[PDB]
Amino acid sequence: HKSEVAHRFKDLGEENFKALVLIAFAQYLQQCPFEDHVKLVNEVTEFAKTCVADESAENCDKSLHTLFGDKLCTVATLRETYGEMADCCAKQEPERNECFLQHKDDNPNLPRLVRPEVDVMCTAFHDNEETFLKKYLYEIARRHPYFYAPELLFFAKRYKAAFTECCQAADKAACLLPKLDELRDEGKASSAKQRLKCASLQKFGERAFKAWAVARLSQRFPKAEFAEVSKLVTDLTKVHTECCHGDLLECADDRADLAKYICENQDSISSKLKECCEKPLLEKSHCIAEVENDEMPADLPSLAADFVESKDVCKNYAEAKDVFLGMFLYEYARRHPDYSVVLLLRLAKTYETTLEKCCAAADPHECYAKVFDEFKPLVEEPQNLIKQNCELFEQLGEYKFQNALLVRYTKKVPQVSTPTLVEVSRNLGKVGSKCCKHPEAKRMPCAEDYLSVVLNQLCVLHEKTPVSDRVTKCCTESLVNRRPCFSALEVDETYVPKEFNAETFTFHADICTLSEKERQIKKQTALVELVKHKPKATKEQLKAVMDDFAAFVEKCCKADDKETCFAEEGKKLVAASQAALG
Numbered sequence: 001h002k003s004e005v006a007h008r009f010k011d012l013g014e015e016n017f018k019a020l021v022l023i024a025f026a027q028y029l030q031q032c033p034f035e036d037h038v039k040l041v042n043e044v045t046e047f048a049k050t051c052v053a054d055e056s057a058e059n060c061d062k063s064l065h066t067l068f069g070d071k072l073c074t075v076a077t078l079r080e081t082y083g084e085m086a087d088c089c090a091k092q093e094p095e096r097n098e099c100f101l102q103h104k105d106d107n108p109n110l111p112r113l114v115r116p117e118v119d120v121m122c123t124a125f126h127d128n129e130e131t132f133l134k135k136y137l138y139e140i141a142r143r144h145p146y147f148y149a150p151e152l153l154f155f156a157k158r159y160k161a162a163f164t165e166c167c168q169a170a171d172k173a174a175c176l177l178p179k180l181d182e183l184r185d186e187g188k189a190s191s192a193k194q195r196l197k198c199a200s201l202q203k204f205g206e207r208a209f210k211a212w213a214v215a216r217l218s219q220r221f222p223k224a225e226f227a228e229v230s231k232l233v234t235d236l237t238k239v240h241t242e243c244c245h246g247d248l249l250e251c252a253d254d255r256a257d258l259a260k261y262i263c264e265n266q267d268s269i270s271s272k273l274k275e276c277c278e279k280p281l282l283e284k285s286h287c288i289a290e291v292e293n294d295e296m297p298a299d300l301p302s303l304a305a306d307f308v309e310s311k312d313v314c315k316n317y318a319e320a321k322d323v324f325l326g327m328f329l330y331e332y333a334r335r336h337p338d339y340s341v342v343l344l345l346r347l348a349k350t351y352e353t354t355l356e357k358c359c360a361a362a363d364p365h366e367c368y369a370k371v372f373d374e375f376k377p378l379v380e381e382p383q384n385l386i387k388q389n390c391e392l393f394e395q396l397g398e399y400k401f402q403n404a405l406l407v408r409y410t411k412k413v414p415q416v417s418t419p420t421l422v423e424v425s426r427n428l429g430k431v432g433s434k435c436c437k438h439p440e441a442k443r444m445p446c447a448e449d450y451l452s453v454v455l456n457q458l459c460v461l462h463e464k465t466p467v468s469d470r471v472t473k474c475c476t477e478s479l480v481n482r483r484p485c486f487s488a489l490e491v492d493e494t495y496v497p498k499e500f501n502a503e504t505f506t507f508h509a510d511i512c513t514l515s516e517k518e519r520q521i522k523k524q525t526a527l528v529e530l531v532k533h534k535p536k537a538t539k540e541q542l543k544a545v546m547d548d549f550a551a552f553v554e555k556c557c558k559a560d561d562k563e564t565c566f567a568e569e570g571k572k573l574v575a576a577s578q579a580a581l582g
């Protein structure tokens with residue numbers, strides 16, 4: 001148009017426009033007070049309304065990157081507060097904006113946000129709901145500057161819907177609390193994934209990312225033709241690159257665009273994209289991204305026909321090595337919405353490797369007619385791991401299950417910090433509960449979704465505090481082997497047991513008055529320490545000690561002289577145990 005601002009205003013809306021400006025300035029000027037941003041937002045919104053009235057109004061012709069940078073350079077305490085960043089204001093536009101993205105601190109040292117009391121929250125939500133949510137929106141935003149604004153705005157409304165529904169119920173706490181935990185864990189998962197995708201695109205590069213996107217895209221759109229999938233996979237990769245770079249506008253438009261292309265060419269991609277294409281500008285992308293698979297043609301020929309038999313495979317392969325392989329992926333992927341993307345990539349690689357060691361022999365045709373037989377083992381390893389673990393998750397509850405992992409992993413890498421083995425083994429227990437609830441078909445894709453963030457979160461720690469050469473060998477290894485590596489770790493025999501520290505096994509009557517979360521963490525923490533002390537204890541020996549302890553807790557948090565029962569009955573447990581574990 002004549003005006004970028006007036007244009008954004010009209011199709012975004014006054015409400016969303018204001019929330020986004022706020023979030024935007026918060027991701028850039030992370031040290032200025034809330035009251036300071038609320039003034040800029042008003043300043044900018046009063047301006048946008050000026051252009052909607054007259055596109056010709058002075059400055060309305062400026063580009064959003066220019067108007068934005070211009071306002072940023074209006075902060076007088078910029079040089080003092082941010083210093084080096086104020087230097088950016090001396091460069092003109094192409095450079096300036098590039099300079100800001102640069103001096104943007106990813107994880108700034110601000111205090112951990114504490115969750116106030118449900119009643120104080122609900123009350124703040126009553127007197128002034130907008131400033132209540134705008135303040136926390138501001139707090140979240142400044143702490144996660146690379147978080148996609150529109151997505152942040154999406155969470156905001158789910159938060160308002162919980163305070164609207166829960167602050168009205170008699171049992172507020174029983175209402176509000178489980179949602180805030182859900183929302184919190186969902187936004188944290190959503191954030192790690194984004195930081196995780198940008199990390200891959202960096203380490204391994206385009207090829208690997210494209211391969212990945214092909215299998216995922218063709219899994220969702222099993223009907224779309226390889227031409228469309230190729231198209232999208234290419235446009236997609238262009239998007240992640242720009243969004244990763246952290247430029248909000250260049251990333252928002254790129255997503256809007258591809259969403260439009262996908263909606264216009266809808267009938268050529270998926271049948272389950274209806275609703276998403278009927279939603280507004282600021283939701284189309286997020287909708288489609290979280291969309292469901294389409295029913296596969298099921299009029300599908302087969303794969304051993306075009307990739308194992310048909311001589312002229314090496315012919316079609318040498319002509320264009322990747323498109324052929326991409327054709328394998330697209331073909332194999334769309335026929336298996338139940339395989340994890342990495343499993344699919346694990347197969348395409350196997351195929352690639354075989355094609356390279358057979359198209360260079362006398363009779364190729366009879367060299368690669370055993371490949372599909374080689375897919376068998378690669379497929380069953382993760383399949384068998386699922387049942388096995390989902391079966392055990394039923395035999396015991398979530399809590400009893402996490403204890404099994406605790407004992408299992410502490411034995412693999414005992415060198416790892418106890419508070420780390422506990423958290424890690426806790427999240428895993430959750431991945432098992434969130435996924436084992438699903439039927440066979442949707443299991444593998446689920447586990448991969450979760451395991452991927454957990455396994456990375458766990459690696460980033462070894463990134464700062466290396467402990468084992470092993471855990472470090474899988475963390476560095478390619479993402480397609482970054483999981484089968486951990487499944488392969490064996491009990492450490494080199495490890496030399498720790499020495500008794502009664503304090504680690506001294507439980508004062510505190511536990512009796514602690515929430516489930518605390519009773520467990522306390523018990524689990526000793527469990528790890530127990531295995532670290534006696535790493536050769538059978539699953540039997542160990543079950544015993546855990547038994548004589550389950551009872552103990554009762555006998556002393558259900559009896560009239562708490563504290564004496566912990567000192568007297570305690571010495572009997574340690575004594576007995578010390579000798580049971582011999």
Ligand SMILES: CCCCCCCCCCCCCC(=O)O
Nearest residue numbers: 505523526527546549550574577
């Ligand atoms: C040296 C041996 C001292 C004995 C230490 C006992 C530690 C066992 C903690 C296991 C907690 C199991 C959880 C539960 O029973 O609910």
